[PDB]
C-alpha cells in the first residue's frame, strides 16, 4: 500500500524516505507537509478530463512556441502544402500499409486523420496520430507544422511518416494514478539597537587563526567585513562581540551572516580559509535568530579566490565531525519577526511623504532625492547583465525610481540601485515591485542569479514565468531553473513550487526535472534540498515512477560494470572484457536491469533487447561503453531500427550538456531570423557524479577517418582534398549541390558558435562530418577561454577557394550569424551566470562570462563589432 510506494520512493532517490522521517529541522518537516498542495492541485489538473488529461501528461505534444513559420521554412513546402506519409497496422498478419497525402501545413490533426480515412476508403473522432518509431503522439489541436517533428521534417527535406492508432488503444494502457496523501512577538522594526554577533569558540579545529565574517545581501557585503582576534591553533575559544555598521530594522528580508576560519601565515601575510558557513539571520517563518547556535561548516571549494564564500550555500554542516563554530545572537526578551507586507506598505509611503516635505526644507545636497535624462535612463537600461553601474548611475536610476517603471526592462539595474542596508529604500523597492508591469521570461531569469536574493524580486521573476513561459522554453532552460533553486534561501519558495507543478502536469519536464536533481544527491551541500523535492515528486507523478526506476536500475548496473572495468580488470584484453560483460548478461539480475527501459536521453525511446554484438568498450579517454538497443516500435524502421547510446563513466559531461545547450538556442536565434545554419546539439545527460549518457548521431564519421582512407593514407601524406572527394562520392549528382550547401552552413554555424563561446581543443578527432554534408562538433572539454580542407569543399573544389563566390556567401552567413547572437547577449550572459552555483571549474566567476562580453564585443558599436569579427576571421 504506502510501504510498496514509500519502497519505490527510496530506490528512485537513493535514500529511505524514513532518513526524511528521523529529521528534526522543522523547516524540513513543513517543506514535506506544505507542498502537497502542490501535488493535489498537478493530479487534479490530470484528472480534469480524464483520459484525455492523463494522456496528455504522459504523452504532451511537442510542439514549437509558435505556430508563425519563418519565411525560410514556409519557401521549403510544396505552394504552402506538405506531404505525409499516414501507416495503418491492418490485423492479423499486422502489416503496415500507408496511404500519402498532400495536405496544408496548418493542418490540425483531426484533419490529416479525416483526410487519411477519405484516401483509404476511396477503393473519425475515435483515432489519434504517432510518429513512427517512437512514442511520441498528436493528442492537440495545433497546426500540424507546429509539432516539432513536422517542422523539423519540412526542414531537412525528410517525408513525415504517421501512424493512425485507436483513441481507445492508448487510453487503456494509462494506468489509474494512485496519488494519495502520506502518513506525515515583536517587530524588527521595533529594535533600536546596532548588529553585534558573539563569536564563541570553535571545536573539530600556519601560525594563527581567526574568524572572517560578514553581513550579505546576494554576494554584496551591507557592512564592512569584521574578523575575530588572531589566537593560536588548538581549540580556539575567541569570546567575542563582533560589531556590524548596520542597525537592526535595516537588515533586509534576505540578509545573510557569512562565515570563515581563516589561516595566516607570516613570511607579506598570507591568510587561506580553511573552512566556510553561511547562516540566514532571518528563519522561513521570518524569525530573527537568537541565542547560542552551533555551525559545522564546509570545505573549502576549489577556485574560491576570497576569505569568505557568500555565494556558497547556507545551513550547518550535516556531517558533525567537521570544524563547529558556536556563536551567541542577541535576544531581544521577544521572538523577533520581519514586518507584514501591510506594515513595509504603511512605511513605504510614510517615507515617500517624509522623502518629499525633506527635499522641499533640506538645506544639503541629496543625490538620491528632462528629455536628457529620459534618453540617458533608455541607453542604460539597454546595458548586458555584465555591464558596470556606477555610484552616480545608481543614484540617477534611483531618483528616477517612478519614470523606471515606464521602462519595465531596467528592473534589474534599478534593483542593484537599491541601499538594501535601508529599510526606507526596501520599502519602497516593494512597492514599485509590487505594481511592476511583467516582463518577457528571458529577462525575468535574470532576477533568479545569485545577485537578486530578495524574495519580493524573485517572486515577481516566478509569476512573470507563470504568467508568459511555455512548457517548449521551459524544457529548453530547465538545467538552469533547477540551478538557481541553490540560490533560494529557504526549502519552500515559490520557484520550486513553479517547477515541480510543471513537473507535476508534463511528464516530459518531469523526466527531464527528476534527472537533473538525481544528478546532483551526491553533493552534500544540496542532498536535502533536492531529496526532499525528489520525493515529493516522486509521490505525485503517477506510474512514471515505474519507469524511473528502471531507468535508475539501468545506470546503477552499467556504474557498477564500468567500474569493474576501469579498476579491477583494466589491463584486460577488449576480448576477455566483453567475456566478462556477456557472463554477467546471462546473469536475471542484469538481464532485467540493461534491457526493457525508456532512454533516459530521450523518454519517448524505447530500449528492447541489448544487441551485445553491436557492442564494444571503447578504446578512448575513460574507457566509455558504445551501447546498441533494438528499437521495439512496431514502425521502427521508419525512424532507427537500433538506438545506440555511450554510457561514460569519469567525464564531468556538465560542460558538454551547456555546450550542447547554448548551440540548441543559437540555431533557434538563427532559424527565426531567416538564418538556416544546421548545427547539431546531440543528447548528452549529466546521470550522477561524472557519469553519464551521449548521443550517437547515425552515419558520422571524424575528418581523422576520412582523411585517412580508412588505414590507407599517412598523416604525412594528408591530401587538403581527400574531404571534398569523399563528399563527392556519396553525394554523387543534384545530390551534390545539397551536400556542399548544408556542409557550409553547418561549418558556418560552428565557426561562430566556437568562437563567440571559446571552445578549446578543436582537431580532426572532435570535428565529424555525416554523409550528407552536415558537420559538427563533438567533445567540448573546455569552454569560455576553419581548415583548408573545409575551404576546398566550400568552394566546390577550386584551389583559390579563399576567392570564389561561394566563399563570399560563406563569409556573409557567418557575419549575419555573428550578429544574431550579439542582439541576445544578454540571454547567453544570463544562461552562464545561472550556472555559476554548479561548481564547474571553467565557469566559478563573472569574470569567465565576460569572456563572451569580448567575443561579442558588447562595449562596441554594430558596425565596430562586425570589423572585430571580420579581424578575427582574415587572421
Ligand atoms: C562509429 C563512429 C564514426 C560514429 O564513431 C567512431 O568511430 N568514433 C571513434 C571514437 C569516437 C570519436 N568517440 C570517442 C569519444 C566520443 C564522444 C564523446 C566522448 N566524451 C564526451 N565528453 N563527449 C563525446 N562522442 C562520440 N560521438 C559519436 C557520434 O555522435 C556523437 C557522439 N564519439 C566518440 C567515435
Not at 583 to 612: I, V
Request: aromatic share 10%; net charge neutral; with cysteine.
Amino acid at each position: 500500500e504506502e510501504k510498496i510506494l514509500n519502497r519505490e520512493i527510496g530506490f528512485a532517490i537513493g535514500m529511505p524516505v524514513c532518513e526524511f522521517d528521523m529529521v528534526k529541522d522543522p523547516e524540513v518537516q513543513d517543506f514535506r507537509r506544505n507542498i502537497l498542495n502542490v501535488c493535489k492541485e498537478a493530479v487534479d489538473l490530470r484528472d480534469l478530463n480524464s483520459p484525455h488529461s492523463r494522456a496528455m501528461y504522459v504523452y504532451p505534444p511537442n510542439v514549437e512556441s509558435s505556430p508563425e513559420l519563418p519565411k525560410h521554412i514556409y519557401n521549403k513546402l510544396d505552394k504552402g502544402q506538405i506531404i505525409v506519409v499516414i501507416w495503418v497496422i491492418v490485423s492479423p498478419n499486422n502489416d503496415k500499409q500507408k496511404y500519402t497525402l498532400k495536405i496544408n501545413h496548418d493542418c490540425v490533426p483531426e484533419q490529416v486523420i479525416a483526410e487519411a480515412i477519405r484516401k483509404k476508403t476511396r477503393s473519425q473522432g475515435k483515432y489519434i496520430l504517432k510518429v513512427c518509431g517512437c512514442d511520441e503522439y498528436f493528442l492537440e489541436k495545433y497546426p500540424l507544422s507546429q509539432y516539432k517533428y513536422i517542422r523539423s521534417c519540412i526542414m531537412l527535406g525528410r517525408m513525415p511518416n504517421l501512424m493512425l492508432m485507436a483513441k481507445e488503444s492508448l487510453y487503456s494502457q494509462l494506468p489509474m494514478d494512485c496519488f494519495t496523501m502520506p502518513s506525515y512577538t515583536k517587530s524588527l522594526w521595533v529594535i533600536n539597537s546596532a548588529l553585534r554577533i558573539k563569536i564563541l569558540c570553535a571545536t573539530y579545529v600556519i601560525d594563527k587563526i581567526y574568524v572572517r565574517t560578514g553581513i550579505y545581501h546576494g554576494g554584496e557585503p551591507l557592512c564592512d567585513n569584521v574578523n575575530t582576534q588572531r589566537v593560536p591553533c588548538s581549540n580556539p575559544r575567541w569570546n567575542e562581540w563582533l560589531n556590524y555598521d548596520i542597525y537592526i530594522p535595516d537588515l533586509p528580508r534576505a540578509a545573510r551572516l557569512c562565515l570563515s576560519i581563516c589561516s595566516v601565515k607570516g613570511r607579506k601575510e598570507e591568510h587561506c580559509p580553511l573552512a566556510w558557513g553561511n547562516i540566514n539571520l532571518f528563519d522561513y517563518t521570518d524569525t530573527l535568530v537568537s541565542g547560542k547556535m552551533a555551525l559545522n561548516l564546509w570545505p573549502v571549494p576549489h577556485g574560491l579566490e576570497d576569505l569568505l564564500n557568500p555565494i556558497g550555500v547556507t545551513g550547518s554542516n550535516p556531517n558533525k565531525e567537521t570544524p563547529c563554530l558556536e556563536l551567541e545572537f542577541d535576544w531581544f526578551s521577544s521572538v523577533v519577526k520581519f514586518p507584514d507586507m501591510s506594515v513595509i506598505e504603511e512605511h513605504a509611503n510614510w517615507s515617500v511623504s517624509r522623502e518629499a516635505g525633506f527635499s522641499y526644507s533640506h538645506a544639503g545636497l541629496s543625490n538620491r532625492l528632462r528629455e536628457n535624462d529620459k534618453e540617458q535612463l533608455k541607453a542604460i537600461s539597454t546595458r548586458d547583465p555584465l555591464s558596470e553601474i556606477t555610484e552616480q548611475e545608481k543614484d540617477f536610476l534611483w531618483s528616477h525610481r517612478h519614470y523606471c517603471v515606464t521602462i519595465p526592462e531596467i528592473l534589474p539595474k534599478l534593483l542593484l540601485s537599491v541601499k538594501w542596508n535601508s529599510r526606507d529604500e526596501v520599502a519602497q523597492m516593494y512597492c514599485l515591485v509590487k505594481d511592476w508591469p511583467p516582463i518577457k521570461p528571458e529577462q525575468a531569469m535574470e532576477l533568479l542569479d545569485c545577485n537578486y536574493p530578495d524574495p519580493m524580486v524573485r517572486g515577481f521573476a516566478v509569476r512573470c514565468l507563470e504568467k508568459y513561459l511555455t512548457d517548449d522554453k521551459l524544457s529548453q532552460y530547465l538545467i538552469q531553473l533547477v540551478q538557481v533553486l541553490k540560490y533560494e534561501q529557504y526549502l519552500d519558495n515559490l520557484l520550486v513550487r513553479f517547477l515541480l507543478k510543471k513537473a507535476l502536469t508534463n511528464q516530459r519536464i518531469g523526466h527531464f526535472f527528476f534527472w537533473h536533481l538525481k544528478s546532483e544527491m551526491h553533493n552534500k551541500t544540496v542532498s536535502q534540498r533536492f531529496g526532499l523535492l525528489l520525493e515529493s515528486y516522486c509521490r505525485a507523478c503517477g506510474m512514471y515512477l515505474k519507469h524511473l526506476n528502471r531507468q535508475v536500475e539501468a545506470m546503477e548496473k552499467l556504474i557498477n560494470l564500468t567500474d569493474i572495468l576501469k579498476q579491477e580488470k583494466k589491463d584486460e584484453t577488449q576480448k576477455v572484457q566483453m567475456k566478462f560483460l556477456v557472463e554477467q548478461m546471462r546473469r536475471p539480475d542484469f538481464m532485467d536491469a540493461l534491457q526493457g527501459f525508456l532512454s533516459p536521453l530521450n523518454p519517448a525511446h524505447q530500449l528492447g533487447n541489448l544487441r551485445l554484438e553491436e557492442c564494444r568498450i571503447m578504446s578512448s579517454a575513460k574507457r566509455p561503453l558504445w551501447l546498441n538497443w533494438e528499437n521495439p516500435d512496431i514502425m521502427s524502421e521508419l525512424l532507427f531500427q537500433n538506438n545506440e547510446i555511450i554510457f561514460k563513466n569519469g567525464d564531468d559531461l556538465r560542460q558538454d550538456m551547456l555546450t550542447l545547450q547554448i548551440i540548441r538556442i543559437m540555431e533557434n536565434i538563427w532559424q527565426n531570423q531567416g538564418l538556416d545554419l544546421r548545427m547539431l546539439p546531440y543528447g548528452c545527460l549529466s546521470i550522477g557524479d561524472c557519469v553519464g549518457l551521449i548521443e550517437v548521431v547515425r552515419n558520422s564519421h571524424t575528418i581523422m577517418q576520412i582523411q585517412c582512407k580508412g588505414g590507407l593514407k599517412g598523416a604525412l601524406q594528408f591530401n587538403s582534398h581527400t574531404l571534398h572527394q569523399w563528399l563527392k562520392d556519396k553525394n554523387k549528382g543534384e545530390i551534390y549541390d545539397a551536400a556542399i550547401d548544408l556542409f557550409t552552413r553547418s561549418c558556418a554555424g560552428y565557426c561562430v558558435a566556437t568562437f563567440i563561446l571559446g571552445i578549446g581543443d578543436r582537431h580532426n578527432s572532435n570535428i565529424m562530418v555525416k554523409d550528407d554534408g552536415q558537420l559538427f562538433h563533438i567533445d567540448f572539454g573546455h569552454f569560455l577561454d576553419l581548415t583548408q580542407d573545409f575551404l576546398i569543399v566550400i568552394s566546390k573544389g577550386a584551389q583559390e577557394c579563399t576567392k570564389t563566390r561561394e566563399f563570399e556567401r560563406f563569409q556573409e552567413m557567418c557575419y549575419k550569424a555573428y550578429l544574431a547572437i550579439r542582439q541576445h547577449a544578454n540571454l547567453f550572459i544570463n544562461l552562464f551566470s545561472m550556472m555559476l552555483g554548479s561548481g564547474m571549474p571553467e565557469l566559478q566567476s563573472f569574470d569567465d562570462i565576460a569572456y563572451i562580453r569580448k567575443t561579442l564585443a558588447l562595449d562596441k558599436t554594430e558596425q565596430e563589432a562586425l570589423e572585430y569579427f571580420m579581424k578575427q576571421m582574415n587572421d
